[PDB]
Amino acid sequence: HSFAMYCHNDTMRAFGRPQDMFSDTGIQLQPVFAQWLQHIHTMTI
Amino acid sequence: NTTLVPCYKSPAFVERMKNAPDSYYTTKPLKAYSQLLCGEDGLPRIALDRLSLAVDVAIPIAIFLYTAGFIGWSGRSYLQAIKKQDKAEEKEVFIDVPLFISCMVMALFWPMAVIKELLAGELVAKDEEIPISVR
Amino acid sequence: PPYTFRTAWALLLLAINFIVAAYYFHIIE
Amino acid sequence: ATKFPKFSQDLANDPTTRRIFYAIATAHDFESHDGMTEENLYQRIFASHFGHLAIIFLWASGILFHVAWQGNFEVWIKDPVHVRPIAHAIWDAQFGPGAIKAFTQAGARNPVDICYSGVYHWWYTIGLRTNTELYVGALFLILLAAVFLFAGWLHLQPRYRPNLGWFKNSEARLNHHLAGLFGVSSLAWAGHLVHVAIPESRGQHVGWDNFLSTPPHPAGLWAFFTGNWGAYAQNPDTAEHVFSTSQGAGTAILTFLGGFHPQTQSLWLTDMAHHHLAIAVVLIIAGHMYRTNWRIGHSIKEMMDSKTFFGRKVEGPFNLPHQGLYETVNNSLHFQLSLALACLGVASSLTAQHMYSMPPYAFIAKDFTTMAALYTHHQYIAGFLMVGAFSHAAIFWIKDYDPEQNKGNVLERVLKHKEAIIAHLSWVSLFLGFHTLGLYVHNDVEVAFGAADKQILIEPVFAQFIQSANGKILYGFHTLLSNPDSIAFTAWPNHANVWLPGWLDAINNGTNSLFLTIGPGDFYVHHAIALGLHVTTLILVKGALDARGSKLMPDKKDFGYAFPCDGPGRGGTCDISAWDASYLAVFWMLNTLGWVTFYWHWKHLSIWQGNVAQFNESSTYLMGWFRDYLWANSAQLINGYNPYGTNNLAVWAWMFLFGHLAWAVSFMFLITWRGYWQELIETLAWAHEQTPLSFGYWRDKPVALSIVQARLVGLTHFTVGYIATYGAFLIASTASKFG
Amino acid sequence: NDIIKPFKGDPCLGNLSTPINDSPLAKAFINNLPAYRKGLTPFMRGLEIGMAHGYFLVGPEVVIGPLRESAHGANLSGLITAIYIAVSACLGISIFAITTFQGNPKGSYSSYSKDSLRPLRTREEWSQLNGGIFLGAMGGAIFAYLLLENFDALDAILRGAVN
Amino acid sequence: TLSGQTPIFGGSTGGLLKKAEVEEKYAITWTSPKEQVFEMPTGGAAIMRQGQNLLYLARKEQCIALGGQLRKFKITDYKIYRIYPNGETVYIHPADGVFPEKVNQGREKVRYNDRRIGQNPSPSKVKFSGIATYDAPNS
Amino acid sequence: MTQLTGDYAASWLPWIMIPLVFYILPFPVFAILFLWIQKEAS
Amino acid sequence: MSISDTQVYIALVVALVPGFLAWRLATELYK
Amino acid sequence: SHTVKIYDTCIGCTQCVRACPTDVLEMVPWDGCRAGQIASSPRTEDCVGCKRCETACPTDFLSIRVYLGAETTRSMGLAY
Numbered sequence A: 001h002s003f004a005m006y007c008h009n010d011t012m013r014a015f016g017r018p019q020d021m022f023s024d025t026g027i028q029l030q031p032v033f034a035q036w037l038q039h040i041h042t043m044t045i
Numbered sequence B: 001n002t003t004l005v006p007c008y009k010s011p012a013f014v015e016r017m018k019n020a021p022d023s024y025y026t027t028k029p030l031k032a033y034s035q036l037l038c039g040e041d042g043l044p045r046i047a048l049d050r051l052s053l054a055v056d057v058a059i060p061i062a063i064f065l066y067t068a069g070f071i072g073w074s075g076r077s078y079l080q081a082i083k084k085q086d087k088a089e090e091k092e093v094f095i096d097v098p099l100f101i102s103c104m105v106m107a108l109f110w111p112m113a114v115i116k117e118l119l120a121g122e123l124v125a126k127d128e129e130i131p132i133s134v135r
Numbered sequence C: 001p002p003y004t005f006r007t008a009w010a011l012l013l014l015a016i017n018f019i020v021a022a023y024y025f026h027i028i029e
Numbered sequence D: 001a002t003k004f005p006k007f008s009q010d011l012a013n014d015p016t017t018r019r020i021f022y023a024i025a026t027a028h029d030f031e032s033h034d035g036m037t038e039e040n041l042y043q044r045i046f047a048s049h050f051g052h053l054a055i056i057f058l059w060a061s062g063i064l065f066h067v068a069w070q071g072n073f074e075v076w077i078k079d080p081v082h083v084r085p086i087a088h089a090i091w092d093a094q095f096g097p098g099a100i101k102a103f104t105q106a107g108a109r110n111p112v113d114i115c116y117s118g119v120y121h122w123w124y125t126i127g128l129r130t131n132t133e134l135y136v137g138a139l140f141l142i143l144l145a146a147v148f149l150f151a152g153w154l155h156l157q158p159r160y161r162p163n164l165g166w167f168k169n170s171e172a173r174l175n176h177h178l179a180g181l182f183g184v185s186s187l188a189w190a191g192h193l194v195h196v197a198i199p200e201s202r203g204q205h206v207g208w209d210n211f212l213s214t215p216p217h218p219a220g221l222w223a224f225f226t227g228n229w230g231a232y233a234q235n236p237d238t239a240e241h242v243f244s245t246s247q248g249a250g251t252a253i254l255t256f257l258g259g260f261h262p263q264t265q266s267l268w269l270t271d272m273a274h275h276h277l278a279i280a281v282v283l284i285i286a287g288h289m290y291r292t293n294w295r296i297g298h299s300i301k302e303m304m305d306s307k308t309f310f311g312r313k314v315e316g317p318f319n320l321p322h323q324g325l326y327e328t329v330n331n332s333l334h335f336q337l338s339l340a341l342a343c344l345g346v347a348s349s350l351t352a353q354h355m356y357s358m359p360p361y362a363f364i365a366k367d368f369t370t371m372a373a374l375y376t377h378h379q380y381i382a383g384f385l386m387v388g389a390f391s392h393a394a395i396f397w398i399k400d401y402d403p404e405q406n407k408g409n410v411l412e413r414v415l416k417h418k419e420a421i422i423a424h425l426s427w428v429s430l431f432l433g434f435h436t437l438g439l440y441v442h443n444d445v446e447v448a449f450g451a452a453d454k455q456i457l458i459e460p461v462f463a464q465f466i467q468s469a470n471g472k473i474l475y476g477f478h479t480l481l482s483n484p485d486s487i488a489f490t491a492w493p494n495h496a497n498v499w500l501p502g503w504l505d506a507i508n509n510g511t512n513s514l515f516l517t518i519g520p521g522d523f524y525v526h527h528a529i530a531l532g533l534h535v536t537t538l539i540l541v542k543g544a545l546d547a548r549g550s551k552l553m554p555d556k557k558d559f560g561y562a563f564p565c566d567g568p569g570r571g572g573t574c575d576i577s578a579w580d581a582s583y584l585a586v587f588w589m590l591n592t593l594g595w596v597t598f599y600w601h602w603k604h605l606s607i608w609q610g611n612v613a614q615f616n617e618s619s620t621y622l623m624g625w626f627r628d629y630l631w632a633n634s635a636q637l638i639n640g641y642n643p644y645g646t647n648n649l650a651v652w653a654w655m656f657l658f659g660h661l662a663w664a665v666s667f668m669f670l671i672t673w674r675g676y677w678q679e680l681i682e683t684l685a686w687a688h689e690q691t692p693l694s695f696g697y698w699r700d701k702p703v704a705l706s707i708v709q710a711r712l713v714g715l716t717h718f719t720v721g722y723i724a725t726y727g728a729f730l731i732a733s734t735a736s737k738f739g
Numbered sequence E: 001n002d003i004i005k006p007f008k009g010d011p012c013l014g015n016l017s018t019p020i021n022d023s024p025l026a027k028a029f030i031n032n033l034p035a036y037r038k039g040l041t042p043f044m045r046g047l048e049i050g051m052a053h054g055y056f057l058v059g060p061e062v063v064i065g066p067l068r069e070s071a072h073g074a075n076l077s078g079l080i081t082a083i084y085i086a087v088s089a090c091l092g093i094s095i096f097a098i099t100t101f102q103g104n105p106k107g108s109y110s111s112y113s114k115d116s117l118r119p120l121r122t123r124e125e126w127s128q129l130n131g132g133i134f135l136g137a138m139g140g141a142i143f144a145y146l147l148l149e150n151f152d153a154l155d156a157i158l159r160g161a162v163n
Numbered sequence F: 001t002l003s004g005q006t007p008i009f010g011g012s013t014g015g016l017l018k019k020a021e022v023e024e025k026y027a028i029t030w031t032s033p034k035e036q037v038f039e040m041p042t043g044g045a046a047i048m049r050q051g052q053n054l055l056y057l058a059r060k061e062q063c064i065a066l067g068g069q070l071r072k073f074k075i076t077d078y079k080i081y082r083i084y085p086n087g088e089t090v091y092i093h094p095a096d097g098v099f100p101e102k103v104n105q106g107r108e109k110v111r112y113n114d115r116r117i118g119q120n121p122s123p124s125k126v127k128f129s130g131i132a133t134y135d136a137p138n139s
Numbered sequence G: 001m002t003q004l005t006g007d008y009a010a011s012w013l014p015w016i017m018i019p020l021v022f023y024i025l026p027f028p029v030f031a032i033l034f035l036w037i038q039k040e041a042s
Numbered sequence H: 001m002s003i004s005d006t007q008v009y010i011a012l013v014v015a016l017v018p019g020f021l022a023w024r025l026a027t028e029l030y031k
Numbered sequence I: 001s002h003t004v005k006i007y008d009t010c011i012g013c014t015q016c017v018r019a020c021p022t023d024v025l026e027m028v029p030w031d032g033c034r035a036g037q038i039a040s041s042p043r044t045e046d047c048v049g050c051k052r053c054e055t056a057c058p059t060d061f062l063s064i065r066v067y068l069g070a071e072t073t074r075s076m077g078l079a080y
């Protein structure tokens, strides 16, 4: 679930399917719990 | 070979002289490269023509092979110098530098030493002296 | 013993080798 | 106790997973199967060669069928320079629109693959012009493969199964293989060239319904038998002849101009027909050398034991004791297999070294990627055959060698001084690596600090003498075919150098690869290559001569060929078997051909792109090999697919990265060793037994795969990653700069 | 010598040991068909027999049936044909099982019959067979119906038209 | 047969698996004069009892690994049994009741070659024969 | 183009055999080839 | 002119002949 | 099912028996030694193949050889 998703992306971009790769534009995988902490650590000022 | 010409007459190599700083390194050596057989790219080269370079393809070879044998002979003669002493087990881990130096001065005239090693039948061990494997 | 068959097959191959060098050094044509 | 594998009983009772694996890797070692006799051994060797010949023919019919069906041979043959050959079609149901568009190339209306095999140029030269001619060739080879699958089945029937005496009839097999298998076949091939290939290169269509009526020469069948043989070379093709047309064509069918066809830049077809005709006659003559059953001929067994040289007492052939060698070679199958592989490994290197310098097929010198892949293919094939030639030398020493029959002969004299041989391969290897790496990294350091004029540059004036001794007037040695007044140039008593004006026209033309210009950068790689061939010979010779054993374990013959070690005692005996010297030498073989093919490719990539002065000025130091070859030519390979699109190199960019992974996963099987994985599998076996809902359970206990197997599993990945990475590099770095 | 032997070595039996019934390949194929595979419950015998038949039985009616002219209606006519052929076939083997297994089956299903070509001789074995044949021939018919009514959607995904 | 009180041990993960009751299983039985603690061959530590001790181990190497540990507690009265799944219990160590380092009478030279290892025959001699070079009834 | 097609004759044939030999037949083949390597010799 | 539609199927049934002759021989070598 | 053969070069140093982790080796009386002993291998189906017996044999080119053969469930040491 880390490396073999890089081989998923490496294969969709080679096929010419950038909309079914784990991109910010394809299938987004957002770091939800780390973008949350980035919000917590800047509103506490 | 005739494609190689001296760096005296070589358009690609005078260009090397033109854009050359000095600092210690590109004037004193680079004048001495003017006597070398120099390619069609301004790069000194080692060609093997005839008597023209028969002495220059012998100065490095004679200087190396003498001092390579000098290291080899002093290192060899020091080994038998301590095998006969029956102390060679620890004589090797703790170098006996007066003995090793005296084995180096024997190795100055090593080319004439190896001949009388060979002519005495003493340089090379006989075949059933030597530990081998099953064969 | 004097080597008579190893020699004259080594000196034969040097001979062929020295002929090749003879054309190499522009000696014989 | 499972049925599989049935050939070995003690592997069938193996309770673990190594019996599935060891069955695969032992399934062809027929001499070690349970309940095998020598009589039964050969009859299965023989019958599995028929099954192998059929696979070669079914593979060859797959080449023909797919270019007949999905290739563009008809379109290609009208312009063999500006259109790309099609290998086959692509059906990957998971392409996107960017890969359909990218791979729809070379005038195709569907995704296709560009043929880099050169079969298009081979068939265009030997006289195939229509797709139907390719299709009936494919159908014929399918049926020709059928008669060998049947023949293999036929010779396992008891009434047709040959006896041991027939197989060990060495003199009868040599007589037929020389005279019939090579002699008649090359005579037959000169028959095709004279009847089909040469006439169809001049425009006229010769086929199966046509060839019986139209003679290939106006003086056919009568100039030969009278002895007026010169009639077959009266008017040859002129220099303005253009291929596969009647304009400029001649009538000569056996003429010996030499050099290249000025329009295809290949050897003349008439020059090839005359070649195989001459080879056939020499080979047929050679096939009447050994007596079969007519008491006129030679006996190989008596040519060994002979000790009388015109009455003079000699020890044997060339005054060397060869007694007992006939019964040594004849009864040893690994001795025979080692000699066969060593001779294909030379014939396959020789294939690669000649087909780039002297292109045989029409317009193949102008297809750089095909020309590049064909060289790298046959050199890598030849490297493996050389490793296997020395592998089976090591099997021969272990299993089928005895000191009794070979007492005092030439084979036993080698073992008397096997350490003198190995110590000297050790010296040459040490000499050639100190002074090639040391001369490269001196050049690196001097170029690094700007003083590129302080490089040690040794002109390879001995190979330049060869080229001058063959015609190259470029250097100026002016001797011996560079000297027009020499004895060799003129051939004074006969002046019959009919081959010389054509050859010297080709060698002195700089637009071909025949005797390429050689510089100081070429000097250094030939010592890397020499260092490479010496270490990998050292590893293999050490493994063959120490297969009987050395002082670390003097009993290696009892333990077989492929065993792990002899424990950690006596210091530790990892990789001690003779098999581990074949394993260790595949790395050096791959490395060495990764210097041969790197040097071939970069030297030609500089000629092809016109930037010849890039190889000459930067192959003398190792960064130039790394910046101007690997880093420079990777640029369009790795951009086969970027965030912005995808092109026809998207598969080469993917196999390039595929081979990096296959290479890296090899290091897992090569660095980490068995007992680490057994303690980890022992843990996973605990987890599976103790967990609910996991209802499966191993029929055979999962064990970490064995020591000699991981060395083979890791060697397969290293090899597949070495070949997929460079295959993708070489194809994409050549077929992207160019067509 | 001769390749045609008496059937299992008994010359009086009304059969022959021939390359079609007694070959290493032919015995291996027939004796591993679901009717004869060793180690199957009668449900799995019928389930695997059923699905092979329901699958192909929808074919001959959706392309040369009366409804072949249209597209959505052709598949219905092919499915229901497989529904009807199988329901009447599974009606056949429920009433076969009732009428042959009635105390001492007259024929090849007797207790002392020793017949290998029909090993289901129980009426505990013919009832799971009926359920397998039915549920199999229904699922096979539906799967071949779903694959055919979605043929345009399936032709695209085996041609890469869906990217 | 076999009996004894099991040592104080909280149970491990390295103990018997499904091979114990399906193929066969081992039992080491020793007597201790003291209530001390020993290292478990399957990981951990257990307290050996005061009388007759019994421990079930998966393979024979564990038992002789433990037996070699018992000799460091000055205990040399241990016996190793092999329990087949049907239930009978064989005595396998020490096989004759005395430890194999000791020499008895009545034991036989088994797999003894009456030659130096150096003159084992070449593999070509036993070519296409059942035997190997190391059985080799010559000398 | 945006589809896999074939200009070659019988272009429908890759359409069915690429699924057949690559992801429909191998699992039956790997099952048959599994039953052969794990059969009792009784 | 590429090969016709029928010529592909002719090769399919022709190649079935060495497809079975391989079975002839693989089993005769006692797999 | 390995094959632990013992050769006549033993000196009865007894060291091979002690190193064996699985009690394959044991001493029998003999006469070709001052020790009057020689190793024997009565329990070789129990041989695990570790060659730990060969490391302990002090005779040059040692008298005891493990000949790794058909590997079974107890010669590979599997607890599962």
Ligand code: F6C
Binding pocket: D684, D687, D688, D691, D693, D694, D695, D696, D697, G027, G028, G030, G031
């Ligand atoms: C049946 C059988 C069986 C079972 C059941 O029964 C099982 C189960 C388990 C569980 C419980 C666990 C968890 C799961 C998960 O999570 O994940 C998944 C995975 C998988 C694999 C999954 C799988 C499942 C199944 C198999 C499915 C099926 C498939 C199909 C059927 C095929 C098809 C067929 C045809 C013929 C081809 C596991 C695991 C592990 N494995 Mg294990 N398995 C087994 C098999 C096998 C084999 C062969 C091998 C070799 C490859 C292995 C390996 C392994 C490793 C490394 C590991 C790990 O890591 C893990 C662990 O340890 O924990 C902790 N393993 N597993």
Ligand code: CLA
Binding pocket: D045, D046, D049, D050, D053, D166, D167, D169, D170, D172, D173, D176, D177, D179, D180, D181, D182, D185, D279, D282, D283, D347
């Ligand atoms: C004319 C009679 C004849 C012919 C045509 C053959 C032909 C063949 N035999 Mg047979 N054989 C014969 C008589 C004959 N044999 C007799 C009388 C005996 C009894 C002793 C045998 C016993 C025998 C055995 C035991 C075997 C064969 C095998 C073979 C096959 C070789 C494998 C192969 O095809 O590779 C390729 C064929 C080529 C021609 C390749 C050519 C490329 C080579 C490698 C390079 C040639 C370059 C040349 C040498 C350059 C140097 C020339 C010089 C002038 C410079 C081949 C078809 C093998 C087999 O069974 O296959 C099924 C095998 O196992 N034969």
Ligand code: CLA
Binding pocket: D059, D063, D115, D116, D117, D119, D372, D373, D374, D376, D377, D378, D380, D381, D384, D722, D723, D724, D726, D727, D728, D730, D731
């Ligand atoms: C890097 C070295 C190298 C290079 C440049 C090539 C180049 C070539 N090879 Mg290859 N090959 C090599 C090494 C190499 N080979 C080695 C070491 C082996 C021994 C295993 C092979 C065995 C081999 C075979 C059997 C064939 C070729 C063929 C070809 C030609 C067409 C493939 C292609 O387009 O190029 C692509 C670049 C590549 C690196 C791919 C090469 C093909 C691989 C190596 C095939 C691997 C065989 C494999 C064991 C079988 C697959 C398993 C199967 C069950 C699916 C091409 C000129 C084909 C041919 O003869 O043309 C008609 C062909 O049939 N080669």
Ligand code: CLA
Binding pocket: D024, D025, D026, D027, D028, D029, D030, D337, D341, D384, D385, D386, D387, D388, D389, D391, D395, D561, D562, D579, D582, D583, D716, D720
């Ligand atoms: C005519 C050529 C020829 C023939 C007939 C043989 C025959 C034999 N060799 Mg061999 N050999 C050869 C050439 C040949 N060799 C070459 C060229 C090499 C150098 C690599 C070797 C090196 C070699 C070694 C080291 C050994 C043999 C052994 C053997 C014997 C057993 C065969 C076997 O292992 O079972 C079957 C073998 C296999 C099923 C191979 C397993 C899979 C291989 C690694 C291919 C994997 C490719 C991979 C799947 C491709 C990737 C696909 C894709 C992802 C790209 C057998 C008599 C063994 C022996 O001598 O017994 C004592 C032995 O250990 N050979």
Ligand code: CLA
Binding pocket: A003, A004, A007, D661, D664, D665, D666, D667, D668, D671, D672, D680
């Ligand atoms: C790139 C090379 C490479 C790869 C792929 C691996 C992969 C792996 N290593 Mg390894 N390792 C490597 C190099 C590599 N290593 C090297 C060079 C060393 C030398 C020190 C080691 C030393 C090492 C140790 C000591 C250990 C591992 C472990 C592992 C496993 C970790 C578990 C995991 O990641 O699950 C994921 C699997 C992968 C990431 C592999 C790639 C998966 C691909 C992308 C998916 C394949 C798709 C599909 C299945 C293809 C099949 C299709 C069919 C036709 C065949 C894993 C399989 C650890 C382990 O065993 O874990 C329990 C372990 O302890 N490695």
Ligand code: CLA
Binding pocket: D054, D055, D058, D059, D060, D061, D062, D063, D065, D088, D089, D090, D091, D142, G013, G014, G015, G017, G018, G021, H011, H012, H013, H015
């Ligand atoms: C060995 C030669 C060879 C090779 C490497 C290929 C390769 C290929 N073929 Mg095939 N094919 C061949 C011979 C070959 N063919 C012959 C002689 C015929 C005439 C019947 C066909 C007819 C054919 C059709 C109709 C199709 C292909 C297709 C394909 C492609 C996809 C794989 C596939 O489904 O094929 C299926 C396999 C067959 C149809 C039978 C071929 C098997 C041959 C006859 C024998 C191969 C067995 C081999 C020798 C044994 C090695 C096994 C093991 C040791 C590795 C692939 C590139 C597909 C395609 O066009 O891709 C877009 C396609 O649908 N081929």
Ligand SMILES: CC1=C(/C=C/C(C)=C/C=C/C(C)=C/C=C/C=C(C)/C=C/C=C(C)/C=C/C2=C(C)CCCC2(C)C)C(C)(C)CCC1
Binding pocket: E051, E052, E053, E055, E056, E135, E138, E139, E140, E142, E143, E146
């Ligand atoms: C004899 C022979 C042959 C033939 C064969 C045949 C005759 C064929 C076939 C075939 C077939 C005929 C196949 C089939 C199939 C099938 C399947 C695969 C199925 C399925 C299914 C499913 C999966 C279902 C499911 C379901 C259910 C169950 C319920 C719900 C719904 C659903 C749908 C989900 C040949 C010559 C070729 C060769 C070999 C031998």
Ligand SMILES: CC1=C(/C=C/C(C)=C/C=C/C(C)=C\C=C/C=C(C)/C=C/C=C(C)/C=C/C2=C(C)CCCC2(C)C)C(C)(C)CCC1
Binding pocket: B057, B068, B069, B070, B071, B072, B073, B076, B114
């Ligand atoms: C001159 C020249 C050349 C050539 C060379 C050659 C070709 C050679 C050779 C030679 C030879 C053919 C040799 C050899 C040898 C043999 C032997 C046999 C040896 C030896 C040795 C030894 C014996 C050693 C000794 C020693 C010493 C001396 C010192 C140290 C110690 C020791 C012991 C090591 C070149 C081109 C390069 C360069 C230029 C010119």
Ligand code: SF4
Binding pocket: I006, I009, I010, I011, I012, I013, I014, I015, I016, I017, I038, I039, I056, I057, I058, I059, I062, I063, I064
């Ligand atoms: S085999 Fe080795 S360790 Fe055992 S008694 Fe003999 S010499 Fe001693």
Ligand code: SF4
Binding pocket: I004, I019, I020, I021, I022, I023, I024, I025, I046, I047, I048, I049, I050, I051, I052, I053, I054, I066
């Ligand atoms: S290999 Fe290990 S278990 Fe076998 S006899 Fe030697 S020491 Fe004992």
Ligand SMILES: [Ca+2]
Binding pocket: A019, A020
């Ligand atoms: Ca999508």
